[PDB]
């Protein structure tokens, strides 16, 4: 039993949250190029046989609601769960279109005791977002 | 009898704790570009951690920022794999 069982009827959901345009009230920069990412991911995970759902420009409230609702689905016939977050961020934080939400609040919905039909199944969160404002200057090889 | 409630999560972060993450306005983000390329090339051949390790190398080696602003120019990035998985993951 070294490998997850991936031969359930369905590979599982792939939820892609693609936040490009943010409310003026926040000022955050429009994330040019993120639509290329979202389409790339949609096609990539389609070829992996995931049930992809693309969602664009979600408020922090809408993100929490979508994650809550998805966590309350019956995943019994699904091998895994994938969630992709494309947005601005800070350490521990991703931005809805109207402000920051803790990553922990999003992932907590899928905890082993809170989403029983994903127990023992891989829950993947793929996060394209800043985690601070440091730059890596690199070092010559 | 029980498993930890935090078990079986994998967080594939685009960048290291504390750091900016880079996105190209025409090509897409460095990390998602590389992630999709490595999944396309290796999802039928490689376990997921080894796929993500090749993503790390691709982002680390083939990308460097170009900016008219010298303070943002010639910068690098390393993604950050955070695994609480208990098993190997193959997509085939």
């Amino acid at each position: 039993d070294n490998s997850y069982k991936m031969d359930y009827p369905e590979m599982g959901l792939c939820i892609i949250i693609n936040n490009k345009n943010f409310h003026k009230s926040t000022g955050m920069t429009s994330r040019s190029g993120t639509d290329v990412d979202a389409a790339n991911l949609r096609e990539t995970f389609r070829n992996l046989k995931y049930e992809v759902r693309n969602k664009n420009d979600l408020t922090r409230e809408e993100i929490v609601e979508l994650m809550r609702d998805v966590s309350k689905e019956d995943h019994s016939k699904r091998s895994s769960f994938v969630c992709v977050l494309l947005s601005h961020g800070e350490e521990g934080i991703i931005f809805g279109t109207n402000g920051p939400v803790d990553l922990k609040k999003i992932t907590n919905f899928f905890r082993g005791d809170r989403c029983r039909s994903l127990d023992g199944k891989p829950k993947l969160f793929i996060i394209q977002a800043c985690r601070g404002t440091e730059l890596d200057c690199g070092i010559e090889t | 009898h029980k498993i930890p409630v935090e078990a079986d999560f994998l967080y594939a972060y685009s960048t290291a704790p504390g750091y900016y993450s880079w996105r190209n306005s025409k090509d897409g983000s460095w990390f998602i570009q590389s992630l999709c390329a490595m999944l396309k090339q290796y999802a039928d051949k490689l376990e997921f951690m080894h796929i993500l390790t090749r993503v790390n190398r691709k982002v680390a080696t083939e990308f460097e920022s170009f900016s008219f602003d010298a303070t943002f120019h010639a910068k690098k990035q390393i993604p950050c794999i955070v695994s609480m998985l208990t098993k190997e993951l193959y997509f085939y």
Partner: peptide, 4 residues
């Protein structure tokens, strides 16, 4: 190239 832009930061996130």
């Amino acid at each position: 190239d832009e930061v996130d």
